[PDB]
Amino acid sequence: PSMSITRLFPALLECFGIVLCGAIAGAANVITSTQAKGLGNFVSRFALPALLFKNMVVLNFSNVDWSFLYSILIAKASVFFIVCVLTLLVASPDSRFSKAGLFPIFATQSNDFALGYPIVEALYQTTYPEYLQYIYLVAPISLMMLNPIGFIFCEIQKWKDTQNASQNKIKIVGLGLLRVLQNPIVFMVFIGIAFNFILDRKVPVYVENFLDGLGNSFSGSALFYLGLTMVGKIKKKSAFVVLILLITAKLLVLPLLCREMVELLDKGDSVVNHTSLSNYAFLYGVFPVAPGVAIFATQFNMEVEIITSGMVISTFVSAPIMYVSAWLLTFPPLAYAIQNVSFDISIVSLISLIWSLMLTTNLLIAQSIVCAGMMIWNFVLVFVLLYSSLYSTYLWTGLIIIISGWGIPALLVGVLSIDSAFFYGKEQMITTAVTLFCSILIIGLFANLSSCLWWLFVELQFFCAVFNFGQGFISFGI
Amino acid sequence: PSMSITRLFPALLECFGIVLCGAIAGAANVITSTQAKGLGNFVSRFALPALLFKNMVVLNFSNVDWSFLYSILIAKASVFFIVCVLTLLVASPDSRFSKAGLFPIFATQSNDFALGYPIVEALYQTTYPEYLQYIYLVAPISLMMLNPIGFIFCEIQKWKDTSQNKIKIVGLGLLRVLQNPIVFMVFIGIAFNFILDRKVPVYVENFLDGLGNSFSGSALFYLGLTMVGKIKKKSAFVVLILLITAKLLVLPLLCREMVELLDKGDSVVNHTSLSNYAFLYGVFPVAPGVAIFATQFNMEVEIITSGMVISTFVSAPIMYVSAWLLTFPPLAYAIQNVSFDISIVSLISLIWSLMLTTNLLIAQSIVCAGMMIWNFVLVFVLLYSSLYSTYLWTGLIIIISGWGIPALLVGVLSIDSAFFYGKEQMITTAVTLFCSILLLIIGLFANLSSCLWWLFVELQFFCAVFNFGQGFISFGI
Known part of the structure; x- marks a missing residue:
């Protein structure tokens, strides 16, 4: 059908296998945190920006389904708003902004580059190759509008910590957008699209081999680095119940909202493609919480513990759900x-x-x-x-x-x-x-x-x- | 012709560019030694081992040119013997064995996997795909015959520092060979090659591909961070130049001669192709393997590591010009x-x-x-x-x-x-x-x-x- 139903196990075998190779090694002490810093720097500063440039200076803007893009975008925006408003409604009076800023981005941001990309490649490599364009477009955009709003909330929290001087445009948005723009996942996208328009959507031959060599060495490397960051991380009853809330607010609530938004917005003439897009969005959100939400929370020095525990747990629960749900969608021999x-x-x-x-x-x-x-x-x-x-x-x-x-x-x-x-x-x-x-x-x-x-x-x-x-x-x- | 002459520089910009990224990063104080150490334990413990199992458990033994294999082997053995006997003839009486064990392996070993494999892929991807089987066979074999003799001298030199004829002389001289992922994993790969029908199971193919394709750029980068703060006497300089003309100058001539007088291919075009291919063999810079060897044995090192850095730098022009000279005889x-x-x-x-x-x-x-x-x-x-x-x-x-x-x-x-x-x-x-x-x-x-x-x-x-x-x-x- 429209899904590579058999490659489910093999694709998950590769992703949940390379990451496993780094957990036992991380547990073996063969590669400690200091050793892992080099791999993290290689996968963050060189391996990933090169991949972004290669996939942006060549990505086509002519044949894309923008309706699917807006549908997913408003689905995550609605989840953002719901999480923010209920977190603001019930919280400690001195910590409402912190939760309202960290929790919903922790539910509207998923690691779709490291883990999602191989999975969607294995499911769609010969059936509908266009889906890679959507996975490569929706993530940076979703990191461009929601992230800043959540960042603005953390700066309101900081203003609670320090009155500052009503920096409505000096601190509220001065660094709220600066942090987004100073990330290799955003500004490199701008450079890639600028070079896409400057050239004829082609990469020069003399640097194509260099970019390919520095780009194809990221998937397994990123999985390994995630493996070394998923050791010794899982550490109250209230923390447990709110964790179950965030986990059911990431791989449970976001899926259904996405499929409803797609089915109510996309008007594809061929209903099979419409259903394919709907279920594609259904497997969107299930992708474990992006480690990018974890480095954020560590830098801001917030509660941290909820996200890092959510960082590890999100991935584990995504293994079975991604498997059964892919089978249930194609179920209606059996x-x-x-x-x-x-x-x-x-x-x-x-x-x-x-x-x-x-x-x-x-x-x-x-x-x-x-x-x-x-x-x-x-x-x-x-x-x-x-x-x-x-x-x-x-x-x-x-x-x-x-x-x-x-x-x-x-x-x-x-x-x-x-x-x-x-x-x-x-x-x-x-x-x-x-x-x-x-x-x-x-x-x-x-x-x-x-x-x-x-x-x-x-x-x-x-x-x-x-x-x-x-x-x-x-x-x-x- | 038989060479993808145009694809050298794109490959040379790749291999030199990727290693350049690690070098400038290692020269940017952004990824220090400890950080690089982790990259080294992920490029040699899984990335490199995984690549060996994928290219050994599927590599065919039915259509290969063994004659080319022995010719290269006896060329590298001849260079080994020549430099060994010369170093033995002239040296300090308490240090002849150390050089006789380190200088010839340093001159017969080369990083054919990190820097040689992408180049030979760029020059032979649609013309002569069998070439990769020869690049994957000759290196492990050469790491199985000459290297043990080297460790023998290493244990002959240790016999001077401190009658272990079969207790140490060969107890660890082969142990070091069999306990390297570049050798024993080859045995495992060939064992699984014969156990299965030269096929890799489907359920593990994606895992092996994911852990194997992430090793070329990673190895080049790792080498980049190992080439910072490494270049540090006149006698040292002259013996270094002697080793540079031993590794990239004399050995290529020996290889081309061995191949032209051993291979009897009916199509002389193929015969000339392999001759320059063997000539290219040896132009590759010394492997990091000789460097890690000499550091573990705790010998002079200086020459090996400086030769390590220098060999690669001089391999860039030689490799490019040589690629053009062989195909020159428009121009x-x-x-x-x-x-x-x-x-x-x-x-x-x-x-x-x-x-x-x-x-x-x-x-x-x-x-x-x-x-x-x-x-x-x-x-x-x-x-x-x-x-x-x-x-x-x-x-x-x-x-x-x-x-x-x-x-x-x-x-x-x-x-x-x-x-x-x-x-x-x-x-x-x-x-x-x-x-x-x-200058x-x-x-x-x-x-x-x-x-x-x-x-x-x-x-x-x-x-x-x-x-x-x-x-x-x-x-x-």
């Missing part, structure tokens, strides 16, 4: 897709839990067989007894302990044809209801109530696969 | 073409470098700028009036005399700039050669044979760099 996502989730998590690998460690080995059962079933009772291990884990989370789990009634059930659950009839489902029965008398068990009772009561199967074949995901975190 | 235009490339870039550095000495720089800039108006078209030929001025301004009221130079009279008095309005300019250039016979001074030596060869194509190739490339000294002074 039965084989249900076991397809289960296979990819299992194999990579199988690597994960083995690295993580008495009662608790019994779950890991029991879970691995469920993951191990995925591939052997994937190529093909011998390969179906994985449910016995899976049924064991259904209560083992809630539990002489080991022998009771080993002596589960599942082997009796095993003694007693499209997918693993519906293979030899329905008599396995009622046994899972006994596991549901034992479940009702830990987060995995609430899945059991809904993942093993839907027949007696496709999107149901989509969350029925991540419940069990992806259960090893928790092992990495614990 | 007259080629002469003004190369004169153009040198003039435009030289002027750029000249400006950044830009009273009597700076009078040369502005006068020189007119010759380069004049080479551009001349490359675009007496008005554009009076660039030679500044050039005749710089012919004695090097040997020079003084600026007043250089302004009142008789060239204005000559200008008052049709293929290329020198032979444009006849030969009466050459008789005046003879006068500039007459005032020369009556920058060395430029006059070119005038001695470059302004009177007609009175007396390679001459034109060396008569263009002397003037249109005169700025070269400005950057160095």
